[PDB]
Design a protein around this ligand. Structure first.
Ligand code: HEM
Ligand code: HEM
Ligand SMILES: CCCCCCCCO[C@@H]1O[C@H](CO)[C@@H](O)[C@H](O)[C@H]1O
Lengths: 49, 101, 421, 55, 443, 220, 54
């Protein structure tokens, strides 16, 4: 039955800031996205250039 | 004074859709409002309109018109869709007005 | 000021008006009517079902569009409930919007236009509405039950038969409304409103002349048996007999016998000990099951018996066991304390039934419709407990001796026929 | 007809069905990259060619 | 009598605390009938890997008899008085309540206390319910909507406590011990974490009196009267896809992390959800429904039904939507659904909120339609807000909400966030996470 | 047969005995025409009482013999005809199974006249149960029966079916003379009895169409 | 599909635009210039290439 289903462990892949299950993941969200989007924004700059 | 009747009867005859056996309403461009109205027409009125149109297209392709005795007469032209179409437009305007409200 | 009166005027044309201020922040008005599949004849079967769904169509005063947008504009709601013999159109909304919502309730019940195209478009909905309803086997057997219990009127199905989906006409909808939605068959009941206000609305807006319009044919008992072999692991069965009708000292007898036999669970996942019927079936079968005392009261008739649900293989024993509990009861096997307990559950039930706005309003209007009056919750209790142990045992006998009608669906391979009970 | 233009419009419909919602195998490797590179050489060659052709 | 006046004239909710830490609250009316019960701040979230499904297992025995009175005796007594005994267990909240004649409020209170304190936990009943529960798990496994919400929590809160289901695991149910259930009860069913609530025709002072008489067993140490704060459950933008093309329709649920009970923003989220609303193929309203999404659903036959939600908890919550659609219309549905969410954050109208607010008011008023629903409010309110919140306060808060506020709050919890997704059934047409994630911005 | 047929011997699973119910099923489907059949446990295959019903069948009316022509030799048809003005059809129904059989009449009539048409058909059965059967009637019916049977075997499909049918339920073959010998050797009494067995036996009924005017078995 | 004119991915296109294409039964000579314009285009390109080669 579905009750016996659980999401596996993604620790071998999680970003450092969301590794701990007892910590809100929202506090590091803006950084996690800021970084990724920073790369994208920079690629757009190099491309525009 | 009855000036319109003079003019509207002249125009009707000048227009000439009646030479194909078409009613005024048979010639309306099918925009959204008209399309909706047509769906509300009773079966027979619908099937009748269809025949008149198919027949006219056959006339148009043949490059002929109907014998003068079959031309619809200004005063016998049936405004079969106008009532429906008006309700349709009214409803639409109501929704429109209301959606700004 | 939680001590308001339950007024109840009654205009000259026969329209009954019952109101009641409870100062609740929400008002729930309704238009009760004596209409239903009961008044349909072969020719217009299902027309009452479609009419139930046609509540949102355009009227002479409001368009389909405004009826929905209007009511929603003020967090209001509009619904229509119906039985084989009564249709209720009620609207709920916050106090300060009763005027708003009312226009719509009015237009829907008195000024429908049943435009041909809107009707044609709506009919396919009957399939959908019906398909979801029939997901509960309960509904299917009850339909067949009334078809086996009667030859007419009440025998008519509550959901439009399939061969007629798409065939009902605007004419039929109009004629039904004209010949049934008459001021003398209607009732404007309301809660969270002031009688003077509701009373005013009625006399000023409700039109559609009085009269009893076409009267329904009398309900003739058949005592038939319909079996639907559909293969389901569970078998639903109902066995009944003609019981008391609405308004009867006999009614109360069956109600009590109902609660004495077993009228539904009271403890979550708990067994029902105070249930003669359940306890009996339980002793007979080891597998999951469910037995209950069935009971319906209509204007000119009623049905009484038991409804079971069991695994296919044990249907036989489960149904017979339920039968013995009825005989055993007809033969004085009813304690005097049993009748005492049942009377509590009955008084309690009734009392709880009115906790919700939907329940209170339905109780008021139902009575305010079949007798333009209102029995005090004390007179009703006074009438119920004043039911001897004899009465009950008699009700039980009337069942064992009366001609029975039955309906069952599922893998009926082990389900007994009415003549083996 | 459709709720979103990406699918109803007769031209976008085409772009959507070949470069946006086009179903692709999840595991194709770098060897499946040369199709698009070939397309880009083609557009690149044409562009530089016209430019050269003008002198 | 105006809506306002009716809101102010509603009897106040009385609260009084006993020395043992239990709280007794009730709202008085003039009804011959009433509902009373104890709302415990316990549930699956309080369980762990070894005792998951205990609180549920307990919920099954809480009615099979106490020490003072074995099964048959317990049942007969309640049945014979026309009282109704129901209850439930969830992730952060449990409840056992009785519907009866105000005339019995005191005997009931005694019964409640006896249930929560002296459950027989019959060794033989335990093995019997063990099989019943196992059957209920197979029954619920066919309830897509609930399988979908379980999965939604399983991934949205993966790795944590809210990830577990209320009913528990198959292994737990097969091995939970009489001692485990006992331990559960002693550990969680405790005075300071419970609330005796009642509504109907009852004397607050008579209620609290019977309360003092039966809810005694005070605590000595400090560890016994302190309400344990639970460890935070981490939210995770992710998805779980359980595919079975053999199923007729597909269920999809998408959600972002919510604020948690105490946060005022919840009033705004509920208004927001009110704009999008809900729908199902039997809403006569049809193509004229105010909810845009509902309108599109009808016009394009996008789904069989859909619904928004703002599930709260102590420190977190799930704000999202769920729909049921044919395998071939999932993509357009998800497209429009996400589209509307974008509209919320970006182009909400004053008209939109005006309506949503009215809708919300009548919705809160509806959740107080009877003694049980009102009693539920009290229990939940004290247990979550540590105090009852009048309809007048809610209405006060609801009234302050405007389009701009909806946009900022919605932008706050929705815009450019990584959602949690659960898809069950014939879900091939549902595009990947990255595609969905993009529907989280611009709209 | 012998060198090829291998699925072997035995009587295999035997069927359960046929238990009579005498129920009543009504399908309200709105058709302009109402088909109805009323029957009673009839005779079994080989049952001596078989020929009696066969003859009573032909005496009441067992199908048309003249294109577009009326059936005068049909007690049942002629009776219904006298009752209704509208198009209709009535016939004696008859089936013989291994351990049971069914006998009665099948009608087809406009919805509004179903009531009278069905009742009319019933009286023709009572009226027959009450000696209302000429000795000449039994003579004529015996011809139509002998004829029918004899024609039935003209086509390869019919001949083969006749042979095999019997060659299966008794590994034998009755001479077309013994069958005729058995048929005419059926007294006028027998027939009247068959007719009685119907009027007294518990009946089962089935009807479909706009049953608004179709009577229930307990009104017949 | 039973006949290639409809299944083949290329013919399918020719069929849906120049063979099974539904056309009004009454269009006149004024509807002939579309195809004529197409032919001018093909004609111009062909003669233009030939000229460009010198
Ligand atoms: C499939 C794309 C093409 C290929 C493979 C290609 C290849 C070549 C090659 C091998 C050369 C000689 C380069 C050299 O000078 O050593 C050349 C010359 C040239 N191509 Fe292309 N070409 C392509 C398309 C075009 C197009 C579209 C045009 C013009 C509209 C064009 C115009 C020219 C011109 C004018 C030259 C002469 C100038 C030069 O030699 O650099 N080419 N091309
Ligand atoms: C839309 C189709 C075309 C149009 C309307 C067009 C029109 C013209 C015009 C106005 C002229 C001048 C004629 C004159 O000498 O008086 C011209 C010249 C020329 N065209 Fe085109 N042309 C078309 C397509 C092409 C194509 C596709 C090519 C080559 C691949 C081309 C190559 C030439 C050349 C080489 C000349 C110069 C020789 C001459 O003047 O006769 N043309 N064209
Ligand atoms: C061969 C003549 C072609 C004339 C061009 C008409 C344009 O373009 C359209 O694209 C669709 C999808 O690829 C096809 O199925 C249609 O047949 C095609 O007409």
């Amino acid at each position: 039955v579905h009750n016996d289903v659980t999401v596996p462990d993604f620790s071998a892949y999680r970003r450092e800031d969301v590794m701990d299950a007892t910590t809100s993941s929202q506090t590091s969200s803006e950084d996690r996205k800021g970084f990724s989007y920073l790369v994208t924004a920079t690629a757009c700059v190099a491309t525009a250039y | 004074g009855r000036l319109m009747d003079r003019i509207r009867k002249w125009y009707y005859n000048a227009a000439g859709f009646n030479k194909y056996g078409l009613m005024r309403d048979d010639t309306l461009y099918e925009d959204d409002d008209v399309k909706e109205a047509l769906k509300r027409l009773p079966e027979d009125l619908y099937n009748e309109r269809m025949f008149r149109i198919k027949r006219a297209l056959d006339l148009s392709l043949k490059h002929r018109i109907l014998p003068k005795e079959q031309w619809v007469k200004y005063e016998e032209d049936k405004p079969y869709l106008e009532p429906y179409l008006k309700e349709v437009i009214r409803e639409r305007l109501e929704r429109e007005a209301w959606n700004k409200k | 000021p939680g001590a308001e009166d339950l007024e109840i005027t009654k205009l000259p044309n026969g329209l009954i008006i019952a109101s009641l201020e409870n100062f609740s922040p929400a008002s729930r008005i309704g238009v009760f009517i004596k209409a239903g599949s009961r008044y349909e004849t072969t020719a217009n079967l299902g027309t009452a079902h479609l009419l139930r769904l046609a509540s949102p169509l355009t009227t002479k005063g409001a368009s389909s569009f405004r009826i929905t947008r209007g009511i929603e504009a003020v967090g209001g709601s509009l619904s229509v409930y119906s039985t084989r013999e009564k249709m209720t159109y009620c609207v709920e909304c916050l106090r300060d919007h009763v005027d708003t919502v009312m226009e719509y309730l009015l237009n829907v019940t008195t000024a429908p236009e049943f435009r041909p195209w809107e009707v044609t478009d709506l009919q396919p909905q009957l399939k959908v509405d019906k398909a979801v309803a029939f997901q509960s086997p309960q509904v299917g057997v009850l339909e067949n039950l009334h078809a086996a219990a009667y030859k007419t009127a009440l025998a008519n199905p509550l959901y439009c038969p399939d061969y007629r989906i798409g065939k009902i006409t605007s004419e039929q909808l109009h004629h039904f409304v004209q010949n049934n939605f008459t001021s003398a068959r209607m009732a404007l009941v309301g809660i969270g409103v002031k009688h003077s206000d509701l009373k005013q609305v009625a006399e000023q807006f409700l039109n559609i002349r009085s009269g009893a319009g076409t009267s329904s044919a009398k309900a003739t008992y058949w005592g038939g048996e319909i079996r639907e072999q559909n293969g389901h692991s569970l078998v639903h069965a109902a066995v009944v007999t003609e019981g008391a009708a609405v308004g009867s000292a006999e009614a109360n007898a069956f109600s009590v016998l109902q609660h004495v036999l077993g009228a539904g669970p009271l403890i979550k996942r708990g067994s029902s000990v105070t249930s003669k019927l359940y306890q009996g079936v339980a002793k007979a079968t080891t597998q999951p099951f469910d037995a209950s005392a069935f009971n319906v009261n209509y204007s000119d008739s009623g049905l009484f018996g038991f409804y079971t649900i069991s695994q296919a293989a044990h249907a036989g024993e489960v149904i017979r066991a339920a039968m013995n509990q009825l005989k055993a009861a007809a033969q004085g096997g009813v304690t005097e304390e049993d009748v005492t307990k049942a009377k509590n559950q009955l008084k309690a039930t009734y009392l709880m039934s009115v906790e919700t706005a939907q329940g209170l309003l339905n109780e008021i209007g139902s009575e305010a419709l079949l007798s333009g009056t209102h029995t005090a919750p004390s007179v009703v209790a006074q009438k119920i407990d004043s039911v001897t142990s004899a009465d009950v045992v008699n009700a039980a006998k009337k069942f064992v001796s009366g001609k029975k009608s039955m309906a069952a669906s599922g893998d009926l391979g082990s389900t007994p026929f009415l003549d083996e009970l | 007809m459709a709720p979103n233009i990406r699918k109803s419009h007769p031209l976008l419909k085409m772009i959507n069905n070949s470069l946006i919602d086009l179903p692709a195998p999840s595991n194709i490797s770098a060897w499946w990259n040369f199709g698009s590179l070939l397309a880009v050489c083609l557009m690149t060659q044409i562009l530089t060619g016209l430019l050269l052709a003008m002198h | 009598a105006t809506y306002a006046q009716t809101l102010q004239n509603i009897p106040e909710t009385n609260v009084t605390t006993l020395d043992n830490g239990l709280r007794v609250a009730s709202e008085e009316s003039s009804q011959p009938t009433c509902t009373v019960g104890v709302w415990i701040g316990a549930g699956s979230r309080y369980e762990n890997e070894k005792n998951n499904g205990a609180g549920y297992f307990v919920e099954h025995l809480a009615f099979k008899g106490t020490k003072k009175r074995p099964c048959a005796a317990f049942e007969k007594e309640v049945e014979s008085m026309g009282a109704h005994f129901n209850g439930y267990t969830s992730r952060e909240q449990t409840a056992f309540y009785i519907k009866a004649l105000s005339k019995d409020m005191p005997k009931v209170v005694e019964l409640l206390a006896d249930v929560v304190q002296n459950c027989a936990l019959e060794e033989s009943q335990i093995e019997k319910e063990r099989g019943v529960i196992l059957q209920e798990l197979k029954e619920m496994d066919n309830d897509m909507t609930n399988v979908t919400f379980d999965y939604l929590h399983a991934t949205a809160f993966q790795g944590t406590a809210l990830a577990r289901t209320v009913e528990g695991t198959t292994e737990n149910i097969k091995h939970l011990t009489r001692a485990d259930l006992a331990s559960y009860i002693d550990t969680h069913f405790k005075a300071p974490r419970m609330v005796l609530a009642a509504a109907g025709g009852i004397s607050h002072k008579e209620l609290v009196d019977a309360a003092r008489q039966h809810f005694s067993g005070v605590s000595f140490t400090y560890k016994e009267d302190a309400v344990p704060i639970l460890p935070r459950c981490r939210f995770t933008g992710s998805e779980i896809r359980a595919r079975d093309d053999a199923l007729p329709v597909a269920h999809v649920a998408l959600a972002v992390e919510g604020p948690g009970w105490a946060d005022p923003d919840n009033v705004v989220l509920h208004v927001a959800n009110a704009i999008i609303g809900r729908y199902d193929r039997t809403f006569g309203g049809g193509k004229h429904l105010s909810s845009r999404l509902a309108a599109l659903a009808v016009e394009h036959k996008l789904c069989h039904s859909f619904q928004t939600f703002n599930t709260s908890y102590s420190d977190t919550g799930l704000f999202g939507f769920h729909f049921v659609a044919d395998p071939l219309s999932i993509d357009d549905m998800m497209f429009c659904a996400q589209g509307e969410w974008m509209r919320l954050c970006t182009s909400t109208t004053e008209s939109e909120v005006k309506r949503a607010k009215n809708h919300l008011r009548s919705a809160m008023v509806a959740q107080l339609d009877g003694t049980t629903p009102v009693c539920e409010t009290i229990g939940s309110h004290l247990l979550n807000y540590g105090r009852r919140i009048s309809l007048e306060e809610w209405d006060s808060r609801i009234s302050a909400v405007d389009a701009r506020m909806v946009r900022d709050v919605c932008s706050k919890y929705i815009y450019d966030k990584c959602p949690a997704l659960a898809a069950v059934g014939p879900i091939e047409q549902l595009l990947d996470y990255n595609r969905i994630r993009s529907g989280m911005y611009w709209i």
